[PDB]
Design a protein around this ligand. Sequence first.
Ligand SMILES: [Mn+2]
Ligand SMILES: [Zn+2]
Lengths: 90, 602
Amino acid sequence: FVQTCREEHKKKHPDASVNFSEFSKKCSERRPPSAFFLFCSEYRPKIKGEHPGLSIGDVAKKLGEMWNNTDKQPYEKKAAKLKEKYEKDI
Amino acid sequence: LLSLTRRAQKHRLRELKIQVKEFADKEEGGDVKAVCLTLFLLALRARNEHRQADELEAIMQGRGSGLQPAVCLAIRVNTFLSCSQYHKMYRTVKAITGRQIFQPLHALRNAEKVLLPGYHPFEWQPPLKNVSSRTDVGIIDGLSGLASSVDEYPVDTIAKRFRYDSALVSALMDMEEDILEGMRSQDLDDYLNGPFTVVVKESCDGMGDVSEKVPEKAVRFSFTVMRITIEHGSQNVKVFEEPKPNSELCCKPLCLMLADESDHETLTAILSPLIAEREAMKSSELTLEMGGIPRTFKFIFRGTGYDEKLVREVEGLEASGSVYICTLCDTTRLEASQNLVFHSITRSHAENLQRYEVWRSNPYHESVEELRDRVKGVSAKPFIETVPSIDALHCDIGNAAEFYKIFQLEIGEVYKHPNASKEERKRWQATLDKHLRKRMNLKPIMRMNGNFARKLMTQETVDAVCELIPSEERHEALRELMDLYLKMKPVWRSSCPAKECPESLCQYSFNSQRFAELLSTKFKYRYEGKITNYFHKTLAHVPEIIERDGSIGAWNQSGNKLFRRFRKMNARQSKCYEMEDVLKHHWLYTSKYLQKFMNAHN
DNA sequence: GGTTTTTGTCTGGCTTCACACTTGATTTGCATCACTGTGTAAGACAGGCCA
DNA sequence: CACAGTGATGCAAATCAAGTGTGAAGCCAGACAAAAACC
Ligand SMILES: [Mn+2]
Ligand SMILES: [Zn+2]
C-alpha cells in the first residue's frame, strides 16, 4: 500500500520530500609508455590550459588528431630507450 | 590490528571472541562459522564493496581463484595426467603461487565417486527380474561369476563392467543440468516429473589389437543417450537430444573386455548378463531424484551400433560371404541383384530365434540344403536383438563402385565385346584412370573410399567421362543416371531428411525405381548375379530405415587409440586392476559434466 | 486464534566500478601447416573337399 | 586408404597504458504491515 499512499500524496503535499518515520506513521494509521603515450602525458597541460572542461574523449581525440597530423622523432627515441631499460629489468 | 601477528590478534580480540561465541551458541546453536561469514559479507556489502563481497561469496561457492575438485578432475582426466604427474603440478603451482589453485588427489577421488555409477539411489517399479536391487554397486567383474577352476572351460580373458541400470542412473544424473534446462527451453516447469522417455542407442565393436609391446584384442560394449522426451498432456515434447550421436565423447562405456569379437563362447558368456539386465529394464519404470523432485524414466533401447559382422554374429546369421546377403530381409545375392528395389524389412529377433529352432529341430525332415533355404541363413541361435542399419558412407561407396564399373565398361563398350578378355578390360580401366587424372585430377586407387566416391559422383565427372564415349545416346543415359544418384544422395546423407530435404525424401522411391529401371534397360551389361550388401540396402531399404530411425547418419576407430592411451598412462600395471582403471577412466571421460568445464571458454 | 518469522515500502546522499577515446606496439586466439605411423576393412589370394 | 595428433606457424583481434567525469548499481536508516507459517 505504502507506495500507492505516497504516490497519491505527491500532489497532496505540493513539492515536499516527506520523512521516513512520519510517513511510516501515516500509512500505518490509515611497461614503458608508447612514444605517443609519453607525448600525451607531456601535452595534457597545454591542451588543458587552453580548454579546461574538455572531456577525456575530447582531449584524447584532439591529442590524437593533432599528433597524428604531425617532428615526433624524439618521442620515439625516448620510447626506445625506456623500452630497452624495461627489457633489462628482470 | 592487521599489522599484528596471530597470537596478538587472538589476544586483542579475545573479549569480542567470547561475546561473539556466547551470542552464536545462544542464538544459532553454536554455528560460529555461519555467523562470522554472514557478518563479514554484510559488512562488505554495507561499505559498497560489492566486488570483494561477491568474490568471497564465489570462494564459498568455489568459483574464483580456487578450482572445484570436479574441474581439477575434468582437467586431469581430460589431459591424461597420471596421479604422480597431477600431484607434481599441484604441489608445484601451490608452492610457487602460495595459493592452492588445483585441489589435492584425495579431493579428486571424492569427486570421482559422484560421477561413477553406484552413487545415487534409485528404484525400479516393478523390481527388475533377476537384478539386484542394491544401488551402491559400481565396477563389477565382467565375467559375472564364470567358473575358473582347472576342470572348467579355460578362461583366457579379463573384463570389467557396470551393471547396466546403475550406469543408466549415472548417465542421467550426469545430464541432469541439460534435462532441466531443456525443460525450461520448451516453456515447461522445472518441477514436472511426468514420465520421461529415454531413447538409448546401444553399441558394440571389437577394438582390434590393443597390445603394448602377440595380439591382444578387446571388445567394448557401450551406450549413448540419444533423446529424452517428456509427456505434457498428450504431446511428447523433447527435452534433450544429443548433438553428436556418433562422437567418442557421449559413448558411455558399459563393459570392456580383453577378447576376440569372433570368440563366440567368451562373448556370449560375458555379454549375456548385460543383455539380461537390459531385457529386465524393457518392462519397468525408473524412479530417480533430480533437483529434489523424484522423476520417473522409462527406456527404449535400440541396438543400432553394430557393424555387419557383429550383427550377423549376435543374431544367429551366417558369415558375410553367405548367399543371404541382407540382415534386414531374406533375399539372396541372386534375388537382390535381379530384383533391384522391391524389398522390405522382414527379419526380427523373434523370427530369428524361431528360425534357429527350426534349423535345430528339422521338423519337416529336410535335407541340409532344403533346411538352409527354409531358415534363410539362421543356423545359430541368436542372443542379442539388433537394429541393423546402414552407414551413409557405405551408400556413397556402393553407388560410386557401380558408377566406376559403368564408366570403364562404357569406355570399352562391353555390349559390343561379350567375349572381351581380362587384358582388354584392364586397358579400359587404364584409359578411364588416365583420363580422370588429366581432367578431374583423380589419382587412380585400388581400394574404394569416401573421398574418391565424393569427387567421382559429380555431373562434371560424367561430362569428363562422356568425352571418351563415342555414342551421345549413351551420354544421355549416363547423365540421367548420375542425376538420379544426386537426387537420392541427400536423403541418406542428411541427419534429419524430413526437414533438410523433404522433396527428395518424398521422391526417393520414384527415383530409386527409375534408377533401377535405367540400369535394367540401358545398362544390362553390368548384371551378373552379384550385388553388395551396401548396394542392396541403398536401393531397397533406405526409406524404410528413415521411417524406422529418422536418419541414416545418426545411427569407433578412435576406440582402439583411446583404450590404449588409458591403459598405458592411467592404469595400474596389474591384470587385476588395469581394466578397472581403464573403464573408470573412460567413464569419467564421457561425462557431460566434466565436458562442460572443458568448454568453459564458450 | 496468538506467536513467531520473512520481505517488502518510502527517500536521498554515499561508495565502488565500467565506459568514454586515442595510437601502436605487444600479446592472445585460433586455424593451419607438413608429416608420417597405425588401425581398419576393401579386396587380392591361398586352399582343400568332392566330383 | 583416412586420420590422429605432434610442435611450429601466421595472421587477425584483443589488449595495454593514461587521463577523469560521468552514469549505473546497491546500500543505509526506522517505524511498520503484508503474506506466512509455528504453538
Ligand atoms: Mn567391427
Ligand atoms: Zn534387404
